[PDB]
Design an enzyme around this catalytic site. Sequence first.
Site, PDB file in Angstrom:
ATOM      1  CG  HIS A  69      -2.054   0.974   1.363  1.00 14.09           C
ATOM      2  ND1 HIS A  69      -1.630   2.227   2.073  1.00 14.09           N
ATOM      3  CD2 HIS A  69      -3.108   1.243   0.904  1.00 14.09           C
ATOM      4  CE1 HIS A  69      -2.869   3.013   1.867  1.00 14.09           C
ATOM      5  NE2 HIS A  69      -3.492   2.519   1.219  1.00 14.09           N
ATOM      6  CG  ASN A 161     -11.366   4.193   0.638  1.00 13.51           C
ATOM      7  OD1 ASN A 161     -11.365   5.111   0.220  1.00 13.51           O
ATOM      8  ND2 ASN A 161     -10.569   3.290   0.856  1.00 13.51           N
ATOM      9  CB  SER A 224      -5.349   4.919  -0.032  1.00 13.45           C
ATOM     10  OG  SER A 224      -5.532   4.867   1.375  1.00 13.45           O
TER      11      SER A 224
END
Length: 279
Positions: A69, A161, A224
């Site tokens: 990530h 989210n 993100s």
Amino acid sequence: AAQTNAPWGLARISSTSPGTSTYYYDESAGQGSCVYVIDTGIEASHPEFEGRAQMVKTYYYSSRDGNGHGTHCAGTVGSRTYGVAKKTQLFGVKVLDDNGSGQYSTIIAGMDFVASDKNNRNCPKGVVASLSLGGGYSSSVNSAAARLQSSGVMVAVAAGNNNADARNYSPASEPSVCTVGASDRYDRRSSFSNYGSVLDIFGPGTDILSTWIGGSTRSISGTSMATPHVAGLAAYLMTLGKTTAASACRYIADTANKGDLSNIPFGTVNLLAYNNYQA
Ligand SMILES: [Ca+2]
Ligand SMILES: [Ca+2]
């Protein structure tokens, strides 16, 4: 400068319109700026970073990004192919473990770390921090983000989210930082993107191709992914001298594409990050 067949999000940030595939930007490319990616780490050896990435802090047994990530987000900030600011310096702060999780106490320490650590680095064009992370509302997390911003760092944070109002999430809900929602390649609000009065800006967040661990690439979606587009844009604009760490979020909102997005709830800004680069 023109990068042909760029990821859609890069093309979008330098365009008045959706549906193009070339990214246009000033060749200065964020040189002399620095972006801290406060995340799972960064695979600094990835060829895409060209030696411009390094790990500066970890709270875990390794500084390695064992998740991907953080590497993906760093790639959108500053990788050669996938990045907005292709000459910026990237600094990794590993506050998230290899499962992508982190205690708020660790995240807070990481923010305070960046506020101090920038004084150990050479960033003559300014300093940005990209925070593609968050959880439920916390005044302490918000306060840490506010301190980091106050200290002279352009702080960009994910809205979250949850397809909900970002007021209930942190650091998204801290007013003084730059809270970033997500859009898709058809200029729709991403299905998962949070919204609300606290959002400052939208950036590309659905189906974003970037770097991944093991020297690889992949496409993923999230606020993100939108956040590092804005962080990289800030670094780029600061290198150009057009704005400062304290004023960059406002400047990006001032200069955004206005009214291009669909499914923006009443009361949320309809503003899409845009570099206004004119050759
Ligand atoms: Ca437009
Ligand atoms: Ca704000």
